Design a protein around this ligand. Structure first.
Ligand SMILES: *[C@@H]1O[C@H](CO)[C@@H](O[C@@H]2O[C@H](CO)[C@@H](O)[C@H](O)[C@H]2NC(C)=O)[C@H](O)[C@H]1NC(C)=O
Lengths: 47, 48
């Protein structure tokens, strides 16, 4: 590879991520919210 | 899941499995997913 490479011949980094499932160990971010008290609220605490 | 519960107690016996009551609290729950059928312990020895 050279600095003056063409778009087709220019280098490209490639990464393939394969997910294997058959207890799952890597899960999603599982975003959260703020806590509010003293009101009729629909709550979800860790499932 | 490999579950390990633990407890530690102070005693002053010489040779017995002491009586009494003590509930073991959970220590860890490791997501291993292996097939376990046999196990062994590992001790320490003194040398000089
Ligand atoms: C964990 O491994 C043991 C290996 O000793 C398995 O016990 C054997 O299981 C096979 C079935 O695949 C039987 O044909 C053998 O007769 C079993 N041997 C003994 C000594 O029991 C055991 O089944 C495995 N556990 C799981 C959940 O698969």
């Amino acid at each position: 590879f050279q600095p003056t490479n063409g778009v087709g011949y220019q280098p490209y980094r490639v990464v393939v991520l394969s997910f294997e499932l058959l207890p799952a160990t890597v899960c999603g971010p599982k975003k959260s919210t703020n806590l509010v008290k003293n009101k009729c609220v629909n709550f979800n605490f860790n499932g | 899941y490999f579950k390990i519960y633990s407890k530690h107690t102070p005693i002053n016996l010489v040779r017995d499995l002491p009586q009494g009551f003590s509930a073991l609290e959970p220590l860890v729950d490791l997501p291993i997913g292996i097939n376990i059928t046999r196990f062994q312990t590992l001790l320490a020895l003194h040398r000089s």
